[model samples]
Target chain A: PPKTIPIVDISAFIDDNASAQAKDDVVKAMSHACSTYGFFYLVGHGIPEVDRQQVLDCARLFASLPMDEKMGISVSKCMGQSFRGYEPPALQLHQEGLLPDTKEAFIFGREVPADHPDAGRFSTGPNQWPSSLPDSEFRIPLLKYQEKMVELVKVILKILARGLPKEWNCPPDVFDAATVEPSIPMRLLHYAPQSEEGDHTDFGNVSVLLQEEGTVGLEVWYPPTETWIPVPVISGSYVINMGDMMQKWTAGFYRSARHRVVNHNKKSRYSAPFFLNGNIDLKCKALDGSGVETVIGEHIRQRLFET
Target chain B: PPKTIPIVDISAFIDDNASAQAKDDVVKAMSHACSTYGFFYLVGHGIPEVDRQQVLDCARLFASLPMDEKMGISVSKCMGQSFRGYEPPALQLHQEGLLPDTKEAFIFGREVPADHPDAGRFSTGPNQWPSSLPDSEFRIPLLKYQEKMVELVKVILKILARGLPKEWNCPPDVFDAATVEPSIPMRLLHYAPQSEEGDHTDFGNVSVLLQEEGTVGLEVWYPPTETWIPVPVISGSYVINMGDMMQKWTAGFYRSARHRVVNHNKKSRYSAPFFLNGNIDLKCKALDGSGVETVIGEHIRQRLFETI
Candidate 1:
């Protein structure tokens, strides 16, 4: 996160408000951002502002639930490879790590019911919503939020395809299948002050980070400048960052820069981050045939076991 | 309907059930159907027989609902240029028309709700399902059936694009826009015995017509052969026909055959035909720039105003 990350408005492409040239300009800016910073603020994304605020409020509400209520759906109960449910604060992230990051979070994935035929394959069966919250209040808004994020992620994949050189010979619909059937996860996080982490990389294709206004803790490493810059919150903007799979697929062309969080704000900092990856079983390989490859499931498993 | 309309399986193209060569065989058959007969039965379309039966069952259920209940959501109340909702047997078929087609029908389009900002412009708002029916039984299956049809239509468009000569220079995704935001209309039609019409061409890109098994009375004009071949019912098959729009787009490469329905059964005949048209206002000219052209709206309007 640079002091002032490039803010690219994607409304032009989505809303049919921009011309062909303008859309191309967005693609170009995104390419530059992906190459130089690996992070940028995407504004004018079409999710309704009120709906976005509603989702944030719900996240806050869910976080405010009593510990006993949250403990009923603790991550340890079913987290094996699913990496779902709630985690109490002070989770020591990795082996031999410093003091555990003081962020309590509620995590969920695509809702697959226990009785669903495919539920066995997806260990992360159904999202665990608080029983106290109304279905209309919590579940609906939460699912809608994830859907909006999923739509944006798919569109970003298309933009990336367009941004790449024609010589790359990429399939325009390469992300279609994975997007339609992805292992998406949404984390509703409440970071207590002093909660911080060292540099780290995400394990998926993209991360859509929506933080509440006035809260700040994110930073990105600018490779060219060789300095860390704090990413300040911009209203109506989502901080999008590329992850490891994207780096490998793009043949190292994109900078999946190391980033970390440090919540110094006295008030509790709230954020919703959705991690989108290709099909869990997809064999991810370098598009340029760079011979570096890994199955999405194994890669995620490896990353999770480490943490 | 032909005593035995050719049954061509398309499951290979839709699913990963067969080899590439087998799928190509399907494309070839479709191209042949498009060129010669301008219509053919597509069997093994991958939609489960049970789901299809459920859709038919719902149609039966909707038709059996009380007249007052059905009249609650009348086409005249809401239909403008959208041409949606239930139309009782022959509302005079149009201006100064003497004959009533004697077909009771329920029409629907892509489900866009009233609150949707663009709903007004769309004209064809959401489908009006009967209040008596459960949303699970009626609405879900109806939308799911439409989705299955839409998916097949898009795939067929791509196949047509690929099957065409490379010299055609047709954009593989030429049908993308219309598909995403289409003016798709589905009619649940019930025709009494001896009720029918003269030959006519459909005013859309394609028509996927599924009639109740063992019922009959559809025929297409074969210009070269100068004959009307009865289209016989084949189980697990959907009769696909090219429409005027497709004829124009292909630069006369494909024919849009004129067909007519004649219900000769002693009992009422039922069928559902989904007309998959492109964007109504799109300025649709031939892909090869062969000068054939018309706006989809104008084509439908012109066809609608004609005498049967």
Candidate 2:
């Protein structure tokens, strides 16, 4: 059999009345996947298929907007410390040598009021909605989808918390408090044909990704076997992967595999990846009882702006 | 000289262009207060005296409502898992032997929408506003005061963070992330004459308190000399104190002093104490590099509900 990412059905974990044995089986599989592959196809996430499709459709529709319309909400044009809004292609710098990736992305996170106490404090402010598209067409659907994703991510984190080693003595909800005001940013990415993003590890805790059907470009580097495995499209499943902060929290027990996208299709490829970065001030410490700790927001700020 | 809680003027820390020495001096005083007394009178917080008086006035007016009217939004009558609204007197349990405190309190915290993701999760939800009071009279002023206090608490935390030992390798904003969505509950307390609350340590991180002038009943226990020190009222200054969570986070470097109120005045006594519990899921670990940790929300829930 070809080496592939493991597909784990987390339905039992999501079920309130599931037997302990059934839930443990899911946790066992999740632990194996996190330890070995650091990438998995998360099935039975309970998010509606229509809702998923709507998010993708919204991404495609926004990408179809004219350059002038998109540029109206360009992140650079926004006043004072707002990171959301539209980004032109090749704006993201991954590595020192890599030419900026050829992906144009529209980014947004949890929206706060203009008078929010944390407003203007490094990625903690209101989102910019495009004036070109009706909110029903773009903002509403995305926010509804974001809420569902938030619930799903909570479930995933609880399961991952259970899978931590017994010797680590981690609380089952160890990831909870830090995530109460989590930095959940969803990016609507559009990749042109023949375009490729440079290889890099995700900077946050976990990424729940959705890719269009029949597309094959996302690849994860396998450190143990020195191979790059192409992530195949799994219908009704999100491609789940751990990120650098998770790896740090686990003290190298869990892997944050490096991954990138190369658009091989003749048509445009669209993917929406929601990044959960925990609260801006959460201090992520290793589960191995080590004193190694880093503030989630500070770490992300450095990775994002200090590229 | 009689022992009194230190008065810290944090104006330099809040200044945009204060000298390093000036800011450090404030931090030094804050560290000493946190380590020794665990309670202090905070001056130069920049919250206007009028705003302070307004919050107290709101509390007094709310307390003055008719019994039938006050019970309209009683906490027990509210639907779902909401913890805000009015609580009847003698309802709080502090210790096993002590009777419920005689204070009747109206509690409110950060308001969330009905459809918020964390709605009905423990103490996360919208507050119940009394139907009798107009929005301009009760709700708006309290919320505005809450916003000002939030800003002030952030500045206080930053100062405390700077005062942490250099060897801890802690970031200057170590307290920032946990407090972003902090569980800030402002309690408008009314204590009748001769009433007293049982002695207990506060369960949250920090408390900013406002008491009516000419009142003397709040006292903190001094462990070293086995004495109880009465906190005097200072005009334009708020009383600041650390709590159990803060003591745990600092590995006991800070003290969560036990204190209680005894209303000695013949008239009704009013006070407003704002409690800042960090995010519901925040894991508070000791700054001493020890692995001791506790979930903040869980701890608070236990302290609150387990008594009942």
Candidate 3:
């Protein structure tokens, strides 16, 4: 994992009619990797390395369990919604920044129907295990690698609905009234480390990420030469990020760069983020509509409903 | 929602029987609401407003359904590792100056083990339904309000383990056992709005938000007068804040502020964050007992393994 972060090839937008000029060089490599490398590098546009090596050998045998079987079950009684099997020790809720957060996670959701009376409030139904926890080859190679990264976030939302305006084919399941519309949400991430804290950018909406191979450190504050940009994690490739909800629907030419998360406590990294979103009802324009007026401010929806 | 932000009861670390100087004055009103309003306004910390009003009426009826029965049970087909249900539309990625996250979400996950064996490589062996999208009063009261917010994030992580040090509670399974843990992410955000963007901060650890009944712009910035400082959300209280994995575990003395999320399309926001982490088998000291280290860098473990 030494120096490397420029690999673009979304399989020429899979023939929008023989990749018309390779879809403008895949939208200028999606406007220079999403506005000057918000993040890039993905290949072939397929997924199969034995379904990502059987979901990394089921995440190396469930992170090699044994914290008394990952804290005697109860991540809020598993699958009932809420979490309890989440990081536990020194999880300091910041009582004066009193330390505690070296990063550790293992949360999962989406099986719902255990008698869908609204899926047990928020799902406390299926994900409840601990008969000794080991037996998912890491969940059937992660549902065939989360359906091959939801078909690569539907081929990058059909190349961001052709960079916006083909009536926005970012259109998948339309947010499910009962399927049939095409859907979107897809996700999967696994990060760990907390001693350093560099670069920052991402909060959801354009992340494909899939690097993992004896990597080290993660940097990215390259705001036009502010300096510091090393994103090591290459193996074959997949690290296309940009979030904060895709800069509020591209009213601002895609860029979620700033990034932070460095704590080389000593190598041992693995990432597999898919985290892409679409179908919030699909209402965003400005692929240059420049129509201006993408409103959203009563001081920003009263502080986004007072959160 | 007219200029607010003070919920403070701080339940003095909840009946361990107060007095560690009233738990250091509720840790100085949570370090003065996370250094002058990154967020703060808790309350008796006992949880139960009907368990937060049946998890906010099961998240306003799982967000009043219909968007194709919530994308025929989407979460992009249960890949986001267990954070079940809803999120679609112009559904974005981000950009515009920077740091203004107009939101939308209905996720749910905590512990995550379902059929084990890597439960489909991370999560989603639990929530799946769409036969007409959100019904049963929006899915059994949002799964008992996400299982009572996962038992109030483990009773607020044992009342935040009273400011740590009791062998510092590990994150991935509450600690100890020769290390390797961290995965305490709790979310329920549902904000929305946008117009410009350029204030920032957020990438995980220590969030604890809880809103529903006000604007949804969400500001912060005041890093000693940089300005901004907005906040909002009240009802029963809880706003907490601070991320970037708790400023790389104390090294930064708890930074993660900057704050941004202003769109203001008018109204529609809801947050329920937990985030907090620590315990990947716990090693992270990097010096402090005089050897002096702890600048907490290296892109903070390469941007937290690129955000978990």
State the TM-score for model 1. 0.47
> Compared with the true structure, what per-residue lDDT tens digits does model 2 show for residues A108-196?
98897779888767777789999888988889989989898888888888989999989999999888866787788899987765544
Lowest summed lDDT across 10 adjacent residues in model 2 chain A is found at A92-101
Tens digits of per-residue lDDT, candidate 3, B1-308, equal 11333334555555674446445555544554544454555655666555665566555555565555566766787744545555554544432211234455666543445665444333224555455534565456555655554444454434333434334333423312111223444445555534444455665445566655434457766645556756644334566666664555544544577777665534455556655443322344411123333222233445646757
**Considering summed lDDT, which 10 consecutive residues are worst modelled in model 3 chain B?**
B172-181
Residue-level lDDT tens digits of model 1 in A127-207: 676788898988888887888888899999888777765676777775565576678988888776554446898888888
Tens-place lDDT digits, model 1, residues B1-308: 22233445565566674456556766776777787788877765667767777777876777776667677778876534566787876544332212334667788888777776546443356667778888897887888898998887887787666656568777777766667678898887776555444668988888999877543478888877678877755445678898988888777677799999865564556788889887777777677767766777677767677733
Model 3 CA lDDT for position A29? 54
What order do candidates take by TM-score, descending? 2, 1, 3
TM-score of each: 0.47, 0.48, 0.30
**Which regions of candidate 2 fall more than 4 Å away from where they truly are?**
A91-101, A195-197, B1-308
DockQ of 3: 0.01
Error of 2 at A214 (Å): 1.8
lDDT scores in order = 0.72, 0.78, 0.49
Off by over 4 Å in 1: A91-101, A117-123, A195-197, A291-293, B1-308
* Model 3: lDDT of residue B198: 49
List of chain B TM-scores, one per candidate: 0.87, 0.92, 0.30
